[PDB]
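Worked example (supplementary).
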Amino acid sequence: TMMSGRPGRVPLQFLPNEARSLPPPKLTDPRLVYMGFLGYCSGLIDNAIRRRPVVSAGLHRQLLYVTSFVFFGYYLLKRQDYMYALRDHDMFAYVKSHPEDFPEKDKKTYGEILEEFHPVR
Amino acid sequence: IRWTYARSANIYPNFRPTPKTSLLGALFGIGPLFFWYYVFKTDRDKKEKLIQEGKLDQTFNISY
Amino acid sequence: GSTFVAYLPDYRMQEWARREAERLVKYREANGLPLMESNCFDPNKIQLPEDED
Amino acid sequence: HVTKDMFPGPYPKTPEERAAAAKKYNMRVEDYEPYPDDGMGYGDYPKLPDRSQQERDPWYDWDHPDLRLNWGEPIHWDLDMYIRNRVDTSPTPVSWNTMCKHLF
Amino acid sequence: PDSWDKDVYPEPPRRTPAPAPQTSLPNPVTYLTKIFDLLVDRPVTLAREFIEQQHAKNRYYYYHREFRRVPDITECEEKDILCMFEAEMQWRRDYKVDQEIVNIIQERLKACQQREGESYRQNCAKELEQFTQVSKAFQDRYSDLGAHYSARKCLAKQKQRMLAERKAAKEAAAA
Amino acid sequence: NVLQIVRDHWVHILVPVGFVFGCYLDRRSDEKLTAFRNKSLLFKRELRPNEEVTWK
Amino acid sequence: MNPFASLTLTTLTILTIPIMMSNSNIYKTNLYPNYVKTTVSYAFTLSLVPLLMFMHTGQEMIISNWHWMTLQTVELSLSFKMDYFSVMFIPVALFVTWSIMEFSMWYMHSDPFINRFFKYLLLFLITMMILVTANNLFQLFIGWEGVGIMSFLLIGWWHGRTDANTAALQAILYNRIGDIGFVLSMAWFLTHSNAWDLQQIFMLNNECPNMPLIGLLLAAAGKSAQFGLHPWLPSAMEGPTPVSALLHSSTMVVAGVFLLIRFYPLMETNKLVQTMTLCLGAITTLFTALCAITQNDIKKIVAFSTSSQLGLMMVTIGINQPHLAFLHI
Amino acid sequence: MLKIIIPTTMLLPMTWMSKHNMIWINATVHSLLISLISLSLLNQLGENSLNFSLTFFSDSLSAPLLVLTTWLLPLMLMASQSHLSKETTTRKKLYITMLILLQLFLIMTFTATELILFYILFEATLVPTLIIITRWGNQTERLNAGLYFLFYTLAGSLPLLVALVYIQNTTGSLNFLIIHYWSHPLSNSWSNIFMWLACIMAFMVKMPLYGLHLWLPKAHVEAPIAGSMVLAAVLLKLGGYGMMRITTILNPLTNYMAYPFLMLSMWGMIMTSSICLRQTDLKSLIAYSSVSHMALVIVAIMIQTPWSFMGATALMIAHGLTSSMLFCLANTNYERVHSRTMILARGLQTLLPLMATWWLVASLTNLALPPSINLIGELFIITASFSWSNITIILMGMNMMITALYSLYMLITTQRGKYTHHINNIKPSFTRENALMALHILPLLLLTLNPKMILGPLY
Amino acid sequence: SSLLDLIWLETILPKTTSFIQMKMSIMVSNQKGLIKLYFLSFLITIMISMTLFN
Ligand SMILES: CCCCCCCCCCCCCCCCCC(=O)OC[C@H](COP(=O)([O-])OCC(O)COP(=O)([O-])OC[C@@H](COC(=O)CCCCCCCCCCCCCCCCC)OC(=O)CCCCCCCCCCCCCCCCC)OC(=O)CCCCCCCCCCCCCCCCC
Ligand SMILES: CCCCCCCCCCCCCCCCC[C@@H](O)O[C@H](CO[C@H](O)CCCCCCCCCCCCCCC)COP(=O)(O)OCC[N+](C)(C)C
Ligand SMILES: CCCCCCCCCCCCCCCCC[C@@H](O)O[C@H](CO[C@H](O)CCCCCCCCCCCCCCC)COP(=O)(O)OCC[N+](C)(C)C
Ligand SMILES: CCCCCCCC/C=C\CCCCCCCC(=O)O[C@H](COC(=O)CCCCCCC/C=C/CCCCCCCC)COP(=O)(O)OCCN
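After joint prediction of all chains, the assembly is encoded as:
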């Protein structure tokens, strides 16, 4: 697809202004919960490497791990949703503007289609 | 222990590809496959030709 | 669990199929129709291709 | 508890390793006789007589009376083929060829 | 018994002979059946009457599920997935019903063979003929479809059979 | 003794709570696919006087 | 209503109660053999009644009581054929079994596992009844394999003896060779007649081809120890004498002749299979009598006599006289 | 489907927060509860499927496999309790974690509605098994065994992935429902031939197909008892399930592409069976018997008829239960004798009579004694093969005889005869072992009463 | 058991793969570490890319 050269694109914008017309991901998004789970696993591994009681060594450190992962994951999800929206928008616009490349197929019914039959013997 | 080891695990390191072993392996491992393939293929070709000519009498042959 | 599996309700619809077949056989024997028909779909709705060979 | 050198090895080519193999299988060097050095991986293993376990002495005090085996003695490559529940090679009152001719 | 339809499972009138003893010796079979009646049939009947009255104290019903007719595969577009789903389900239900029809005819045939005795070869001609017709129709409909059978494959098989029949009819007419 | 055997047997609630949460999760998924509820040609039905949806 | 069916099913059912009680307290006492013997005598007396009913009138029955499963157009159900053969063979088998159990109460008195031995005998009797009263090929196969397993277990009764285990495995091997033909016949009948039920097989086979009948003949030769597959019967004398008298003498080894008798409507329409059966029976009876003429073990003499009698039964089958073969059985 | 997945996931924290002496009890109890919950999947329809969501669906082909998978976990825990006595708490928890992760991956794999999802979980099942084999295996060959079990598998499955993505670029979907409803014939072409081979070989190598089966004896004889149980009972059936699913897009090429494999199976089942006649290791014998049964399943799937599919499903379930029981019996001998050689411990019926009864029942079930579901599957497959070609009976018949022989051979060598004189450490059987055998064998004889549950979607 | 399963089926797929991969590894990794030969090879590949892909 290569939307790097897409016209009207700001060189270093993480989320453009037009991205604000899309619904934001919910705070209970399953992907956000998975990001928080990744942060929790990072905290547990940090406890294990430093040779501390894994489950209950640093609660502030684990909370910061989870919170940072959730924050970055929320913004990443917003950007990903925006990029897929752009892809679909361009696809539909291109199909609309080139009708001779996407003709409407003349609908046919299985009663008037001759399909070959292969017996299983 | 020596008996079980010789029967199981000492086989391959003492294997040497020789005309006798090569010929016996080829025969015993390839000949049966092609023999059975020929037999079954001939049988199924005969049955298919009989079905196409319609002279097989498959009456009551409902389950396959 | 074995008792639960034994008393599983008939979602596979065996007795339903039996009743339907009974009614169909009754109707077709009553009106002289030849029980099961050789064609699954009636040919009136199939448009075969003309060969003209 | 068996050492690495106590396991079956490759076909013995020199009389010294021949004698070494014979001692490993608890037998005399004159009685030791490996399988021919063909392709199949018999290797160092000794080729014992093809007699069945049924023709061994039933009045001897074997350590394993049912198998008629002694602890430590070399086991025939095909012991599971001759276990008194399977093919035996005991001499018969009538010769094999005569029996085959008469039955056929 | 009213538990099944007598027309779907027909039976002959069941004419049985009358006892015509020829000697004065009492046969043991009659006495054995009388003692069997007294010792077995009465208590079983009483238990059944108790259970039946208990069932009559609590009467409730269940129903046969009726299915609407939907368009079949012969009027579905090439890629219209919803219509093909409905048609496939309907075709599968019809396949099950046809299997049960064949089962009913086979039961008729087996009962005839047992009932007729030594003259089953002549007295079970009708059941054999009915089974022959139903078996031929079922074989034409559903044979050789494979394990991955579907309504589309059945339609293809029917279309090929109709093409062959049309060609044969045209060849015979133009003979 | 309560508040002492809990510290050893609180573990036995994890799997049943997971089961209840899984059932609840399954119910949520069902709501999303209601696009054809009471719209199939086979089960198309008129609603009862006090019925809002045919199934849940 | 019509006590025939109730009586016929009750005989087979009450044959099974001591098997259920084999885990109760009676099994751990010394009254269990008498329990089994009394049960068998009661079953014989009960089974004497449907025989009287058939003798008076000619009562014949099919009882398809439990529906097992349905593979599309093929319905498999638990069905019993209470015909002349069943109602005549059940009393004879029960009478012989009662005599053999009374004999074993004296013969195996010093055996530590006499309860187990009696239990094994009852299990064989149950499997043989299942074989004899079956109406479809699957139930008949169940009985066919059950009697073979019981034969394996009872031949190798003294499991510390190598020869007993060898003889048991030999019996299994030969009967498996026969099982090949049994499975061939089942596959052929399912593929062509669309049934394992006997009624449909008789209806749809007015001129039976060679393949299913040859499979049936192979199974009969395997289980009745005909000349090709004969030695396992003399080898089976490793078991205790009551086992040799019950299974390998009069009741279990006539199962192949019974299978050929059950399929006699299809057998009379084939002349090649009849000739094959005739020749097999004749060579079997001659060879086994010739072998018996010089034997020194008395049990071996009687076993070879049994084999020759079975060959004579197969000769009778070959000349299209199945009821005579049943009478000889 | 999450009502089964979530508790299986909750097994992990429950295991890790458990007391040091209560891991086995809690794991066994909650695994049994999960099995009871999964029993509800058996209520299937004659119609399409139980399509829970866009991601997971259940069928009467998937339901018995799921029930077997959930039932095998408590048995594996019971079997592993013994030989893991002297192991540290953390490593025991890691072992239980590996078993739970394997169960989770299998559960998801059977119910996945997408071919790519199925591939990912089908490969994810490899890592726990490899760790179990190469970490808690006993002999030094385990490392080599693990390597084989890995690379064979991967050598088959890397082409499949390629084919899969190729298919999704042509049809536009890999969802199984759409794939079934939009199926199109495969024309006879070299490209189509290689696509067929790519779609088939990954499932062939895991059955395993004869000639590609060299990894299985190594892996099964070198694995710990739980690893052997899960490998023989469930992991072999993944190839059968995959071939049953994927053959819908391979027609009518299968009509002639199946010939090399069919032969390789029909002859192969003979060879492996004969191999069982001359074997000095119990586990090796049981593994080769597994190869023979799976060759029969391969024939059933390649024949592609309703009776073939019913027989293949029934045989898969029956073989899983039977092979797991046989491996457990062999291990209960090994933990007493520490040898794994058939002719060392002899005449065990005299010393352990109830275990001898368990041996007899397991041998009878492996021998396919009617009316066991083993024989039901075998007979349905044999009838379908006879319809395919009447000559097949010969090979099939031969296999039957041979099978009985080696089965009874294994029963006679270990249980009958005279006891070995110098072996004086054979203790009475524990309640745990007897309960393990009972929990293996009772479901089989119960299932013979309702065979429709294990006959698949074509019943 | 011996000829097919333990020898030839082992010879065909796994052992041949191991032998070929090990020989190729020895071929590739057995380099003396002299920049002489490395840069001569670099010159050869530069000429090949110049005179083969255009
Ligand atoms: C689809 C997947 C779904 C599941 C996801 C799976 C992954 C999730 C977790 C990922 C990682 C995060 C946590 C791991 C950190 C490592 C720490 C550790 O080692 O454990 C020690 C610690 C216990 O030990 P300790 O007494 O504290 O101190 C001991 C020392 O730590 C050290 O002890 P030691 O030194 O004495 O012992 C040494 C030992 C220690 O070695 C280790 O244990 C290291 C751990 C392995 C490396 C981790 C890899 C990183 C993540 C990759 C995961 C791969 C998954 C992909 C699938 C492939 C499967 C391999 O090493 C050895 O013995 C060497 C032998 C090696 C054996 C074979 C190696 C296999 C490793 C593969 C493991 C993969 C699964 C691990 C599951 C969790 C394990 C704890 O474990 C824990 O208790 C914590 C586990 C998680 C806590 C859960 C508590 C939450 C419960 C609250 C309520 C329930 C929540 C639900 C909410 C709703 C309720 C209302
Ligand atoms: C030991 C000494 C003897 C003591 C015992 C004496 C008593 C003997 C009785 C034992 C067996 C004798 C046979 C009697 C059969 C009667 C019961 C039978 O009829 O019920 C069957 C029912 O059996 C069950 O369906 C099968 C058992 C379920 C098996 C599931 C296993 C449980 C989970 C374990 C884990 C799974 C592992 C394997 C995964 C695949 C079939 O019933 P069905 O005619 O049809 O319909 C039931 C009634 N309806 C019509 C209302 C519906
Ligand atoms: C090792 C343990 C077992 C592993 C598993 C083995 C299973 C894999 C076997 C592969 C199945 C067969 C592959 C191709 C079958 C197609 C049929 C074709 O080969 O037969 C003839 C083809 O003729 C010749 O075979 C041409 C090819 C000859 C070269 C192929 C090599 C032959 C042997 C190689 C075996 C090596 C296998 C192991 C690789 C490492 C038909 O003639 P033709 O009508 O014209 O072609 C029809 C196909 N069309 C329509 C696409 C054109
Ligand atoms: C246990 C070890 C087994 C190892 C795996 C064996 C299976 C090998 C299967 C072939 C490998 C590649 C599969 C290709 C993936 C499918 C995609 C596809 O089918 O597309 C084909 C492409 O097909 C190919 O290109 C395949 C060419 C083969 C190249 C790789 C060779 C690998 C070895 C081949 C021989 C061995 C195969 C059987 C091995 C048996 C087991 C040992 C069409 O391409 P297009 O150009 O887009 O369409 C044509 C119209 N323009």
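Two points are worth noting when inspecting this output. The helical segments of chain C are 2-6, 14-30. Chain C is about 40% helix and 0% strand.
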